[model samples]
Target chain A: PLLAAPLAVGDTIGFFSSSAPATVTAKNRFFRGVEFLQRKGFKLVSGKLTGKTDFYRSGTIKERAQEFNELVYNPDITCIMSTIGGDNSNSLLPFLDYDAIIANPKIIIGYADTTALLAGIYAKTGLITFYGPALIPSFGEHPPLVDITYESFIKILTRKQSGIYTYTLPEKWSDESINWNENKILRPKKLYKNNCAFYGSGKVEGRVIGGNLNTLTGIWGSEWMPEIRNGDILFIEDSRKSIATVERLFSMLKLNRVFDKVSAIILGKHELFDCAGSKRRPYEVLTEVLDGKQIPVLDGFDCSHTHPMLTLPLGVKLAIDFDNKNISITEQYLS
Target chain B: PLLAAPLAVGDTIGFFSSSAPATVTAKNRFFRGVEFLQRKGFKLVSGKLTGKTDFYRSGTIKERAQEFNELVYNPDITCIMSTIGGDNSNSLLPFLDYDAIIANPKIIIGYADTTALLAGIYAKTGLITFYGPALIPSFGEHPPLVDITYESFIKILTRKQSGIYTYTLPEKWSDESINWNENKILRPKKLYKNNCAFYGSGKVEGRVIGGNLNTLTGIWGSEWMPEIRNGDILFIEDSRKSIATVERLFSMLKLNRVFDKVSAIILGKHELFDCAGSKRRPYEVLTEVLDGKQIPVLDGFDCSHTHPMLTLPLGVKLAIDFDNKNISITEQYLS
Candidate 1:
C-alpha cells in the first residue's frame, strides 16, 4: 500500500486557488504547500495563478476566466486544484462554459467556498469529483497535513475509494479574527462527531449531491441547482455566514420545493456570529425550517466549514444507514 | 359635486384595516375622521377591530385571519381602511384564501406595508384593488382629511364614468405625531405638479395594474407574479427601505423579464429615504436599472409611502401619455 506508484519527479499536477488572495504572505504559504507536496515526489504543474499576483487571482470576471482557461489548456497538468473561494463565485458560473469543462474531464479537488465550481462541474458533467483538500486554506496553512486529511485524500485520489468520513473530534476551528491564522496556537485539530440530531432518518439509497448550502442556493435562479434525480441524497453547510442569510437561502430552496425531491438532507455545524448588538445563529434557523419538513437530517458533519474535514467524492455512489448511524462511500468516484 | 345622494346613514360600508392597528389617540383621530364621513350620511359600522384593541388588528396569523374573516362575513360594511403600515405583511398572504374574500367585492384602501395584502389578494382573485391612505396615518391623524386622498377617493367612489385622473401635489407629511381628534390643521400639502421622470417614454393605453414594488417581488413565487396580465400597465414604489433592496427587486423583475409583458410602467414617488446619500437626490438607482428594456416608465405620482397618498383604482383602463407626461384613467373604479 505504501510503495504503489509514488509520483515520480516532473509528474505535473493541476492547481488553482479557490479563495480570495489575502496577501503576498498567504500566496507564499500556498507556494510552500505546493512545495511540500513536490518534496513528497510529485512535480508542481501550474494552472491559472501559479505565479500570478495574489491581488488579481480571480478578481474580476475576466481575471477568473483567464485563471480558469489556464487550467484547461495546461497539458502538463494532470488534475485541477482550486486556490480558494469567496463571496461572489456565482458571478463566474453564468459565464463559464459548462460543456467545455465537462468535455476535458479533468479531476477537480475543491471544497469550502470553491463549492460553486466543484458542484457546478459535478452537476454539469456526469463525472464524479473529489471534494477534499485545496491549495490555499487546507494545504497552504502552516501546520503539516493532519492524519485525517492526508489519509482521506490519499484514499479517495490514488485508491479511488473512500471509507467512513468522520468529523474531527474534541474541538472545532473558530474563525474569529482575534486569532485569525494561528493554527496550533488557536485550537487543536479535532473531530465533531456528534451526529445525533437526525430529522428525516428513513433508509433511502441515493447518490450524494450538493455542497456548501449557501453556494447551492446563491446561484438558484441563474441555473445552479443541478438536475437532481428523484432520490439523490443532498448535503449542505455554511461557513461563517449568518443563520438569517442561510434561512433566506433555505427559504429560496423551499419556495421552489427543492427539498421535497431529495431523499436525505445533512447539515453542517452552525457557524454563529455576533455583530454590534444582534447575534446570527445559522443552525437555529436551518434547523427550524428543515425540522418543519420532517426529513432525515444529520448535523455536525466533520466535513463542512471546519478544519480537518471529510473529503466527499462528489457524484459517487453512497449509502446511508440511519438505523446504524453510518455513511459510507460504496464505490470509487467514477471518471 | 359635494352631496348629491351623499353617503347616507346605515349604508353598510366595510371598514378593514389595511395597515397596522393605531394607538388609542390615533384611534380617536380615526373616529373623528369617521365622524366627518359619518356626518356625510354614511353610518360607521364597526370593522372586526374598529372598536377592538388595535393589537388584535393585524400582527399574528390568527389575528389577521380573524379580522380578515370578519370583513369577509360582514354584509353591513361598505368600504375598508388601513390603520397603519410598517412591516411583516407577507405572513398574512400565505394563510389567505381568495375564494373566501372574493365571495364579496368591496372597496379596500391602504398603501405602504398594506401593499403586501393588496397585492396578495389581487393576485389571488384578479380583483381590482386600491392604494390609498390608511385610517390612522391619514384619516385619524392631525389633519381631518388630506385633500389629495379625499379627491382621489371621490374619483374612485363617486365618479360614474372614468376618463382621466390626475393629482397635482404629492408631498411628505412633516408632522410625526399629530392627533386628528383634537384639531384640523391644514398645511400646504406640497405637490409635484405636471412633472414626472420619463424613461422610454411614449406609452400604450391599457388597464393600469401593480402596487408597492417591494410587495410585488416579496410575493413573486406565490400565486402572484405569474398571474399578471400581459399588456397591462405596472406601477410600483418602495417605502423607506434602502435603495439597494429596491434595486435588487428591480433587477430580479428585469431578469425575470416581467416588464416585457406589461404595456407601461409607472413609479410612485418614494418618501423617507432616497438612493443617493443625504447630500444628493433620490430615484437614481431606479432610473439606472430602467434604462434599457426601457419600457415607458413614468414617475412622480402620489401613490407613495406618505400621507395625502393617491387613491388610484386598480384594474381601471388608463391612458398613459408618457410623451405628454399624464395618466388618464378611462374607466371608473366604482361600478
Candidate 2:
C-alpha cells in the first residue's frame, strides 16, 4: 500500500466539497472550521467549489470531481479534505483521476458520503486514506469538543509518533441535532458518558477496510470497492439511519459471506439510529443477522459519527484487544 | 432454466407476509386483494405469518424464512405471492431453503422488497421468477386500474402464448399515496396518460435481469445477485426515491462496468419520484452517469411501481424494439 509523507507544521490542507455545498450552506461553521485549523500552525486552501452550490450538491458530478483532481495535481497541497459529505460523492467516482492521485500521494480524508472517494482511491491507486473528519462537521464545532478532535488529528498526522498508535477515548461525546449556521447552540448538547463495548475476546489483527455504511452501499459491488479478504478487519459506521436499513446492510454482508471471511469486525458507533419502535441498537441488529457466527466484534468504537471523532488510516493494519477494550493502529500510515 | 407449470383456475397460490405485516395493518386492502383472486376461481392459502407481526417486520429473520419454506414444501401450492413489500425481506436470504424451491419449482411473484426473494430464488435455483405484483400494492387497488393488473396476471400465467409475448400499455396509471386500512379512497387517485419512451433505434435482445433499484442494492454484491453478463438486457426500476439516490444507484452500475456489458437497458417508470428541486427525471440522471456510452435505452417502460403494473419474467430472454417502441418476452417462461 502507498503511504503519504507525514504532514508537518505550515503544510497546506486543500479542502473540497465533493458532495454537499456545506461551505455555502453553513457559512458560519465553515469559516469557524477554517479558522480553527489556521489557529494551529497550519495553512488552509479552499477548493474552487468553496462557495458553489448546485441544489443538493456543491456542483455537478464532473465539476466536483474536477475540484478534487485540481487539488491532487497541486504540489503545494500536502493533504486534501472534504468540506462535508452528502449523497452525490459516489456519482463522481467514475470521473476521478486515479493516475494523478497516484503521482502525488496525499492524505485524502472524509467520512459519510466521502467513503465513495476514500474507498475508490485506495482501491485504484493503493494510497492509504483516512476515515476521519470533514471540515464543516469535524473542525467547525463549539469549544471543548473541537479541541479534542483537533488534538487527535494533530497527533495522528503532524506529531512524531512511533510506528504504532493507540486511540484515547474521549470523556464525553454528543450527537445532538444542531444547526451551527447560527451563533447560538440553541441548547447545549446533552453529552453522554463513554460506554463503547467490546463484544469478543483476544486481539484480532489484519488490514482494516470499510467506512460509512450508507455511503459504502453506493460503491459496494463496484471494481473500485476493496475486497474483504480472509482475516481482514472490517471497520464500518453509519449515522442517523433506520434499523431496517442497517439490518439489510448487515444481511448483505452475511449473504456475501463476509462474516465467514473476516477475522473481526469493528462496528463504529451509530449516531442517532432509528429502531422503528423496536428500540434495538445497531449491535443487536448485527447479532441477529450474524445468526450464531462467532466472529469477534468491537462495538461502539469512537471512530464514527459522534462528536470528537477519532481518525484512523484505512488500508493499514489495525487490531482490537477485546480484553482491554482497546483498538489501535498496528502499522505505519505515513512515510 | 427451470420453469414452473402454468397456473390453472383450480391452482392454489400461497400468499406470504415476508416483510411487512400488511394483513394486520391494511386489513381492508388485504381482504380485497384476496377476494379479487378468489373471484377468478383460484384457491388461496395464507402463509404461517399471515396475521402475525413482530414490530416493523412480519416476523424475525428465521421465522420469515420458515414461513416461506413451509409454502415451498406444500404440493398444493402452485404459486407463492408476497402480501406487501417492506424493508426487511433481504434478511431472510441466508436462511432460505433454495433446495426446496428447486424441488417445487412454483411460480414466485412480488415487487419492491420482494426483489430480494425473486432475485435470490432465480440466482440460486435457476427457477424463473416474476417481477410483477404483490397482494396489497397491486391487487388491492380500486376501479379500472386493478382490472388491467389482473388482466396482465391472467394473460401471463394462464393463457398460452406462442413462446413469445408483448405487453399492452395501460391507458392511465397512478402512484398517489394512501392509507389502505380504511375503506374510503381519500381523493381518488389522479391518473395520467402513458408516454413510455424508446430512446434508440432497431432492436436489441438478451437475458433480462434487475428489479427495484433500492431492493436490488441489498443483494447486489452477494452470491444472490445474478451477474450482469455481457450482451444482457438490464431492466431496472424504483419508487418514491430522491433523484440523488437514483443518481447514486445508476452511478453504482456505471462504476461496476455494468454499463459496458449490457447491450440495452429497459428503465421502468419511477413511481412518484422526488426530484429535490432539480426537476430532473430518473432517465436524465442515468444519462449523466452514462456520460458518452451510447447504449440503447428504453425509458419509462410499464413494468414498474406505477399502477396497472405488468408482469415480467426474471432470468429469461427478452428484447426491446426501439423503432416500434415495443418490449417482449422472446422465450417461454412456464412449463
Candidate topping lDDT: 2
Q: Candidate 1 has what TM-score? A: 0.65
lDDT of 2 by residue, A1-335 (tens): 89888888799999999988899889999998999888886798899999987877888889999999999998999989988988889988878899998888999988989999999999999999999889999999887788888888878887564766878998998888775677667666788998788888888889999998888888988888998899899999999988888988898888888999999998888888898899889899898898899988888887888888888899999978889988888888888
Candidate 2 has a DockQ of 0.78
B-chain TM-score of model 1: 0.80
TM-score, every prediction? 0.65, 0.98
* CAPRI grade, predicted model 1: incorrect
Candidate that would win on DockQ: 2
The positional error of residue B135 in candidate 1, measured at the CA in angstroms, is 5.8
Query: All predictions: root-mean-square deviation over Cα?
Result: 8.2, 1.4
DockQ for each numbered candidate: 0.09, 0.78
Task: Give one digit per residue, the lDDT tens place, for model 2 in B1-335.
Answer: 99998988878999998888999988899988888888888899899999997778888999999999999999999989988998888889888898888878898999989999999888899999999989888888877788999889888988784767878888898777764556767767888898788998998989999998788888889988988899999999998998878888899898889999999998988988998898888888888889989999988887788888999999889988899978889988998
Worst lDDT 10-window in candidate 2 chain B: B178-187
Whole-model lDDT per candidate:
0.57, 0.88
Please report how far candidate 2 places residue A21 from its true position, in Å. Answer: 1.8
